[PDB]
């Protein structure tokens, strides 16, 4: 919806934004559902006047009679009149006294010490570390070869335990379309399967499109077979410079005649005559007796199609077997004494990484206290003891006198250290909104936590508002 609130307010004498409160009422809305990233206004450009000249910016003033603001999501308390109108309101992200007004539903707060919220510091980045990572797969041994087989006799390349590196597959030398049966062209390295069956051969370019589920022809009936639900891809490229003789390579054959169809991934490589008609040849090879395999007859000077086009298949499968071929993403660097979202081979936690004095045995990868909590983790490719330290969470109190006697407050950050993080209270890192206190003036330290906004006095007065560990705050006259 695009609801538009409205209230004509001519009570103003002309002053820019007079101090007060009012209520707004809406009128209409309608749906569009469009992404928007530009805001502009349109004038009655045929009549322009009262436009002065200036160069004001960065919190200055210059006569415009226009006002622009950008709204934000806030929690916000209202007061309803007995008639029903709105008489007063506060927001819970401005000042500690406002948050105190919000934690207990009233417009007045009395003397004492309260509780508002926590101030847990957020992480800065994320890091991932993996095994040394290597023993990768020699997939280059497939494409880079001079012994490419035939369609009626192909090679079966099964990939054993290694690391699946697909960087040289789509990013390097992508001669033709990927022709992915079922896989993400971008997420090739992300998800991995058990084993890959690779076959290399040559067919006609016009017959290259025949390599797809549910497609038949001269090569998909007896020579080569594919499952309908095949997963993986096929890579094709020109090979005119590979196999092109003066007369052309005739050693490549294709099956054309057979008694029945072909089972999925079956090789019927054989040399026998075909029983055509009523001539059961027993070596005659004469009338109605021909060899099912027919010479391809390569032509170096011919155009597309008949030119050597080599296709290598990748038969993926997802079977309930241990992972064999998988390529993980490269492990990032390491940080110390910085709150980050560390990940160590399936150990995604947040906190601070520091060097540990422990002496893990050669078969130790975790570490625990008696809490069922992860304590120390060994680096997968540095072989040392990396200790784990949590974040710097803690609560926030607020010390105030009566709201109708004073308006200034002091905030106690219990269980933390002003030498630690909260002194550098900054936007987008600390949940509390007010990053406005200098955190260098009127800063004091106490066993229960460091206190902001009060000055230690070496007098001795009876306790008014207890704090803890003997320190007792109070309002006073200087």
């Amino acid at each position, epitope marked *: 919806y695009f609801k538009i609130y409205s209230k004509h307010t001519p009570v103003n004498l002309g002053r820019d934004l007079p101090q007060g409160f009012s209520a707004l009422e809406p009128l209409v809305d309608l749906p569009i559902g469009i992404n928007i990233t530009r805001f502009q206004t349109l004038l009655a450009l045929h009549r322009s006047y009262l436009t002065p000249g200036d160069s004001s910016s960065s919190w200055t003033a210059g006569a415009a009679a226009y006002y622009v603001g950008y709204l934000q999501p806030r929690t916000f308390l209202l007061k309803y009149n007995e008639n029903g109108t709105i008489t007063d309101a506060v927001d819970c992200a401005l000042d500690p006294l406002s948050e105190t007004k919000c934690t207990l539903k009233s417009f007045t707060v009395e003397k004492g010490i309260y509780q508002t919220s926590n101030f847990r510091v957020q992480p800065t980045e994320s890091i991932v570390r993996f095994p040394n990572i*290597t*023993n*990768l*797969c*020699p997939f*280059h*041994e497939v494409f*880079n*070869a*001079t*012994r490419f087989a035939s369609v009626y006799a192909w090679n079966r*390349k099964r990939i054993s335990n290694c690391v699946a590196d697909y960087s040289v597959l789509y990013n390097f030398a992508p001669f033709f379309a990927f022709k992915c049966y079922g896989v993400s062209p971008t997420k090739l390295n992300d998800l991995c399967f058990t084993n890959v069956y690779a076959d290399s051969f040559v067919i006609r370019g016009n017959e290259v499109s025949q390599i797809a589920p549910g497609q038949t022809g001269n090569i998909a009936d007896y020579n080569y077979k594919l499952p309908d639900d095949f997963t993986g891809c096929v890579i094709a490229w020109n090979s005119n*410079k*590979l*196999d*092109s*003789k*003066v007369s052309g390579n005739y050693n490549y054959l294709y099956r054309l005649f057979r008694k029945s169809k072909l089972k999925p991934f079956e090789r019927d490589i054989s040399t026998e005559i075909y029983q055509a008609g009523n001539k059961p040849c027993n070596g005659v090879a004469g009338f109605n007796c021909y060899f099912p395999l027919q010479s391809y007859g390569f032509r170096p000077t011919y155009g597309v199609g008949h030119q050597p086009y080599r296709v290598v298949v990748l038969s993926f499968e997802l079977l309930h077997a241990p992972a064999t071929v998988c390529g993980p993403k490269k492990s990032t660097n390491l940080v110390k004494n910085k709150c980050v979202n560390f990940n160590f081979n399936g150990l995604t936690g947040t906190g601070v990484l520091t060097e540990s004095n422990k002496k893990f045995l050669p078969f130790q990868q975790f570490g625990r206290d008696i809490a069922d909590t992860t304590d120390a983790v060994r680096d997968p490719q540095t072989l040392e003891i990396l200790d784990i330290t949590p974040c710097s969470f803690g609560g926030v109190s607020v010390i105030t006198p009566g709201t109708n006697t004073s308006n200034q407050v002091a905030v106690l950050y219990q269980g933390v250290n002003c030498t630690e993080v909260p002194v550098a209270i900054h936007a987008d890192q600390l949940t509390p909104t007010w990053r406005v206190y200098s955190t260098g003036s009127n800063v004091f330290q106490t066993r229960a936590g460091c206190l902001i906004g009060a000055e230690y006095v070496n007098n001795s007065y009876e306790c008014d508002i207890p704090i803890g560990a003997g320190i007792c705050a109070s309002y006073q006259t200087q």
Partner: antibody
Framework: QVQLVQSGAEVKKPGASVKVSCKAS????????ISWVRQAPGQGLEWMGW????????NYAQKFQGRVTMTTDTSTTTGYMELRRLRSDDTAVYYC????????????????????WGQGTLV | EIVLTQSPGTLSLSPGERATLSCRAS???????LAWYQQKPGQAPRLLIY???SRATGIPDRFSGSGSGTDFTLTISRLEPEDFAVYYC????????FGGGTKVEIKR
């Protein structure tokens, strides 16, 4: 980035054995075969040695068949020739290279040659 | 064994002229089986071309490959006078062999 290093010059007498070292770093020592050639003034290079990395399969040349033996260390990625049957004037330089003609896993004929070489040893 | 017959005995020509390197096959070499090796005086050998003319280490405009089928050769245009390197050609169809050899002098 590739760092191939070798030992220094040596002097050896006939009847003993000469040891030659070639250390490799910067590239994965699992998928590239190790080749060893001999170069001397007045002639070109040879095909004295060829070893893989996954297995201990050898491709020694027919000229020096049964007379060359070299070990391969995957931890330090080092080729160690322990050449025997020393002869009086076998003084020539030896070069270790990362082959790109036969793979270290299957071993078919690749498209390439000795793109990366070592620094050489003198005996 | 099959060896390659090379007859560039000496290219006694000044730098900046067209140069021809011969790698005539003995009986038969595949189209996709060729390697070119560079050897500057007192340096480690290095591969130049892993095929006919496809570049491996830079090769801005000098080293080129030509031919097809059984016969092949190398063409040099606008040679830079510093190199004066030794060029070898290698076949891959039968084990691993090197060429006869090539010498290029100063040509003052």
């Amino acid at each position: 980035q590739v760092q191939l290093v070798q030992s220094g010059a040596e002097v050896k007498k006939p009847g003993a054995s000469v040891k030659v070292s070639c250390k490799a770093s910067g590239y994965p020592f699992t998928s590239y075969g190790i080749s060893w050639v001999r170069q001397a003034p007045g002639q070109g290079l040879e095909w004295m040695g060829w070893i893989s990395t996954y297995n201990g399969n050898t491709n020694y040349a027919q000229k020096f068949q049964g007379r060359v033996t070299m070990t391969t260390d995957t931890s330090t990625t080092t080729g160690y020739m322990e050449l025997r049957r020393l002869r009086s004037d076998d003084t020539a330089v030896y070069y270790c290279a990362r082959d790109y003609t036969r793979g270290a896993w299957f071993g078919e004929s690749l498209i390439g040659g000795f793109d990366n070489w070592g620094q050489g040893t003198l005996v | 064994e099959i060896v390659l017959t090379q007859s560039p005995g000496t290219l006694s020509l000044s730098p900046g002229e067209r140069a021809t390197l011969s790698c005539r096959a003995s009986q038969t070499v595949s189209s996709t089986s060729l390697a070119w090796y560079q050897q500057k005086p007192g340096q480690a050998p290095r591969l130049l071309i892993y095929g006919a003319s496809s570049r491996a280490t830079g090769i801005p405009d000098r080293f080129s490959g030509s031919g097809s089928g059984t016969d092949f050769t190398l063409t040099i245009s606008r040679l830079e006078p510093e190199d004066f390197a030794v060029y070898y050609c290698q076949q891959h169809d039968t084990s691993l062999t090197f060429g006869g050899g090539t010498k290029v002098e100063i040509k003052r």
